[PDB]
Amino acid sequence: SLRRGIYHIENAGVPSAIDLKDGSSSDGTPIVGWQFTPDTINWHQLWLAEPIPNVADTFTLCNLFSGTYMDLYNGSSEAGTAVNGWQGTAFTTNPHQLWTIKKSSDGTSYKIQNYGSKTFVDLVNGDSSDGAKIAGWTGTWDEGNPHQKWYFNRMSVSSAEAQAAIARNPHIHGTYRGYILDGEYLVLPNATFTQIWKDSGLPGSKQREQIYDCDDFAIAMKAAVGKWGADSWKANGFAIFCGVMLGVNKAGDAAHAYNFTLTKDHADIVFFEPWNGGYLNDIGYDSYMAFY
Amino acid sequence: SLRRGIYHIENAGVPSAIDLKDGSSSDGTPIVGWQFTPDTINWHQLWLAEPIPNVADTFTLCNLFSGTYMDLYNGSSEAGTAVNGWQGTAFTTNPHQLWTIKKSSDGTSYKIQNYGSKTFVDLVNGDSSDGAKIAGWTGTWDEGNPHQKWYFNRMSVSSAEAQAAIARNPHIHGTYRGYILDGEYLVLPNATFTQIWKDSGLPGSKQREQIYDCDDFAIAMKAAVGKWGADSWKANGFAIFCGVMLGVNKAGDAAHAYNFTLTKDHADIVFFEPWNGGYLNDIGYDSYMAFY
Ligand SMILES: C[C@@H]1O[C@@H](O[C@@H]2[C@@H](O[C@H]3O[C@H](CO)[C@H](O)[C@H](O)[C@H]3O)[C@@H](O)[C@@H](CO)O[C@@H]2O)[C@@H](O)[C@H](O)[C@@H]1O
Ligand SMILES: C[C@@H]1O[C@@H](O[C@@H]2[C@@H](O[C@H]3O[C@H](CO)[C@H](O)[C@H](O)[C@H]3O)[C@@H](O)[C@@H](CO)O[C@@H]2O)[C@@H](O)[C@H](O)[C@@H]1O
Ligand SMILES: C[C@@H]1O[C@@H](O[C@@H]2[C@@H](O[C@H]3O[C@H](CO)[C@H](O)[C@H](O)[C@H]3O)[C@@H](O)[C@@H](CO)O[C@H]2O)[C@@H](O)[C@H](O)[C@@H]1O
Ligand SMILES: C[C@@H]1O[C@@H](O[C@@H]2[C@@H](O[C@H]3O[C@H](CO)[C@H](O)[C@H](O)[C@H]3O)[C@@H](O)[C@@H](CO)O[C@H]2O)[C@@H](O)[C@H](O)[C@@H]1O
Ligand SMILES: C[C@@H]1O[C@@H](O[C@@H]2[C@@H](O[C@H]3O[C@H](CO)[C@H](O)[C@H](O)[C@H]3O)[C@@H](O)[C@@H](CO)O[C@H]2O)[C@@H](O)[C@H](O)[C@@H]1O
Ligand SMILES: C[C@@H]1O[C@@H](O[C@@H]2[C@@H](O[C@H]3O[C@H](CO)[C@H](O)[C@H](O)[C@H]3O)[C@@H](O)[C@@H](CO)O[C@H]2O)[C@@H](O)[C@H](O)[C@@H]1O
Ligand SMILES: [Ca+2]
Ligand SMILES: [Ca+2]
Ligand SMILES: [Ca+2]
Ligand SMILES: [Ca+2]
Ligand code: NA
Ligand code: NA
C-alpha cells in the first residue's frame, strides 16, 4: 500500500504534476496539470495522503498549502467530472474526497480511483499544457492509459525512516541517544533549508562565549524551520525535518552543537553548520545526542 | 572564596546597590549607589565576577549590561578616588580592574579591595541617595565600617547547581537523561520569563497537530530566551537559564514537551507551560529528557 505521507504526484505520460490552481483555499478551485521544478518546493503541488481506517488502500488527499481536499464534484461517475479543492477533514466519510490509490499495470505509477464513483483521476487528452483539465474518467485498474497513471514522488519521511538514516551514519558516538518529536516530516531541498537559515537572521549573528554560541545557533535554526512550517502550510498532521545534534571530537576534549537534514533519496543525513550555512558529510564531531 | 557568577552587590548599611550610571559603556562612567527592586532585572546593577588564575580571591567585575569593567581611576590609593566603568577584558593584568573580594568581619557581607591600591570600595558617607559617590577608600579587612561592606546577592547558577535542582525534583522519569549546553546561567524572575514569553508571540500561536505542537512551543520559548540574552547584555561568558523537557504521564501512554526555570533560592525547578504561560510544581508528566 501507499504509505501515509506527502507526495508530489506526476503524470506518467507527460511531466505535469497535480496542481491546486493558485493554491486557492476557495471551494471548487480547479485541480489541473502544471509543469514543475525538481529539487524545489512546488508550493501548489504537495498532497498529504492520510490512510482511512477499515477501508483498504483508501485515502484523503489534502493540499499541503491550502489545507483543502481533492474532491470529485458531486461524486458524479460521468466522464469529464471536475476534480477540485474543497473544504473537508482527514478522516471524512464524504466519498467525494475518498480515493483508492493502488499500483498501475507498470508496477511503479499508481491509479487514483474515487471511492464513491469508481472513476479515475485523468489528465484529459494527456494535455501537457499548464492548467490542463484533470477530471474523473471511466477506466480500468489494469490498462496502460498514461492519462490515468501517476507517480507518487515521496517528499516526506516517517520518524522511523529518519531514525534509519541517522543509524547508517558513520559519525555517531557510542553513547548516542536520539529524541523523536513528531511522526511524519517534509524533507527540504538544501536550497530551501538555506533560505530559511538566511531569513532567520543567523548569518549576521556574532558567536559569543555561552550567551550566543553553537547551541544558540542550532536551536535558533530549528525554531526558524518550525516557524516557517506553521507560517507556510495550512494542512496539519506533519512537521518539517530539521535536526539538532550535540557532538564530541575524536580526542574527546571538544563539543559542538549543529543541525542536520536528509539527502534527496531520504537514505542518509547531512550535517548543517548554522554558523556559516555549510553542508558537511563530516562536521568533525560524533553526535552523542539528537532531537528532531 | 566567592564563586564565579553574576551578582547584585548591595551595601550592608543602606539598601543601595552598586550601579553603573545609565548603564553607559563610555569610559569613565561613574559607578554609584542606587536603590533597587527585588525580583526584577536591575538592568544597570548586575556584575559578572571572573576569578583570575594564580591570584587568590581576585576577580574582574564586568557590568552585565555595558560589558565594561569596574575600574579604580588611575589606580590611585588616595581616599575618594573615582570608581568608574572602563573598557577592559575578563583576565586583564591591569590592576585598576582587579579586585580582591573576601568576607567582612560579619562573615556574610564582603569587602572589595583594589588589587593595585589595596584601598576598598566605599559608599561615601553611607549616602543612601540615588547617585551617591562610590570611591576607593583607606580601610582594613576586619573593621565593622558598613560604608565598605557589600552583600554579593547571587543571581546565577552553575550547570552543576542546575543539575542539583533537577535531581531533587520528584517528577523525573527513571530513564531521564539531561544535556548541558553552557556553564553559568542568569536565573530570571518569573515576571521577566513571562515577559519574554509574551514578547515571543507564542501567546497567539495555535496548537496544530505535529506542524506547531508542544515541541514547537517549548523550542520556540528556549530560542526566544536565547535571543533575549544576546540582544539584552553586552557582557560574555554566561547564558540565560531556560530548560526544555520531554515528559511522559503516569499511565506511560502520553508525552508532552515544556519548559522549566528555577526558584528564587536556586534550589528547585518549576515547570513552565509555553501554551498558556502557566507555572506548575507538577505539570502531570515525568521528564525523560532535558536540555538547558
Ligand atoms: C488515445 C486514446 O487512449 C484511450 O482513451 C483515452 C480515454 O481513456 C479512458 O476513457 C475511455 C472512454 O472515453 C475508456 O474508458 C478507457 O478505458 C479509459 O482509459 C481518456 O483517458 C480520455 C481523457 O483523457 O483520453 C482518451 O480518449 C483509449 O481508450 C483510446 O482508444 C485511445 O487509444
Ligand atoms: C562614621 C565614621 O565611620 C568611619 O569613618 C568612615 C571612613 O572610614 C574609612 O576611612 C577612615 C579614614 O577616613 C579610616 O581609614 C577607616 O578605617 C575606614 O574604614 C570612610 O568610610 C568614609 C567614607 O565613606 O566615611 C567615614 O568617615 C570611622 O573611621 C569614623 O571614626 C566614624 O566612626
Ligand atoms: C508560489 C509561486 O510558485 C510558482 O508559481 C506557481 C506555479 O508553480 C509551478 O509552475 C511554475 C511555472 O508556472 C514552476 O514550474 C514551479 O516550479 C511550479 O511549482 C503553479 O503552481 C501555478 C498554478 O497553481 O501557481 C503559481 O503561483 C512561482 O512561479 C511563483 O513565483 C511563486 O513562487
Ligand atoms: C451529499 C452531500 O455531501 C456533503 O456535501 C458535499 C460537499 O462536501 C464537503 O463540503 C461541504 C461544504 O460545501 C461540507 O463542508 C462537507 O462537510 C464537505 O465534506 C462537497 O463534496 C461537494 C463537492 O463535491 O459536494 C457536496 O454534495 C454534505 O455537506 C451535504 O449536506 C450532502 O450530504
Ligand atoms: C532600564 C531602566 O531601569 C530603571 O531605571 C534605571 C535605574 O534602575 C534602578 O533604579 C530604579 C529607580 O530609579 C529602580 O529602583 C530599579 O529597580 C533599579 O534597577 C538606575 O539603574 C539608573 C542609574 O543607572 O538608571 C535608570 O535607567 C527603570 O526605572 C527604567 O524605566 C528603565 O527600565
Ligand atoms: C598604566 C596604564 O594602564 C593602561 O591604561 C589604564 C586604563 O586601562 C584600560 O583602558 C585603556 C583605554 O583607556 C586600555 O583599553 C586598557 O587596555 C584598559 O585596561 C584605565 O584603567 C585607566 C583608568 O583607570 O587608567 C589607565 O592608566 C594602559 O592602557 C596604559 O598604556 C598604561 O599602561
Ligand atoms: Ca510532536
Ligand atoms: Ca549558549
Ligand atoms: Ca554552550
Ligand atoms: Ca512538532
Ligand atoms: Na486504510
Ligand atoms: Na584566583
Numbering used by the authors:
A (entry chain AAA), B (entry chain AAA): 2 to 293
Text of the article:
The Marasmius oreades agglutinin (MOA) is the holotype of an emerging family of fungal chimerolectins and an active Ca2+/Mn2+-dependent protease, which exhibits a unique papain-like fold with special active site features. While acting as a dimerization domain, the papain-like domain of MOA retains the characteristic L-/R-domain partition of PLCPs. As additional feature, the MOA dimer carries two binuclear metal-binding clusters, symmetrically placed at the dimerization interface (Grahn et al., 2009). MOA requires the presence of calcium or manganese (II) to switch from the inactive form to an active protease (Cordara et al., 2011, Wohlschlager et al., 2011).
To explore the significance of the structure-functional swap, we generated and tested the activity and thermal stability of both single- and double-site MOA variants targeting positions 208 and 276. A MOA variant where Trp208 and Gln276 were both changed to their PLCP substitutes (W208Q/Q276W) completely lacked proteolytic activity and also had lower thermal stability than the wild-type enzyme. The catalytic cysteine (Cys215) can be modeled in two different conformations, oriented approximately 90° apart. In the crystal structure of the double mutant, the Cys215 thiol group was found to be chemically modified to arsenocysteine. The formation of an arsenocysteine has previously been reported for other thiol-based enzymes (DeMel et al., 2004, Winger et al., 2008), and is a consequence of the reaction of cysteine with cacodylate, which was used as buffering agent in the crystallization conditions. However, simply substituting both Trp208 and Gln276 for their papain counterparts in variant W208Q/Q276W was insufficient to preserve enzyme activity.
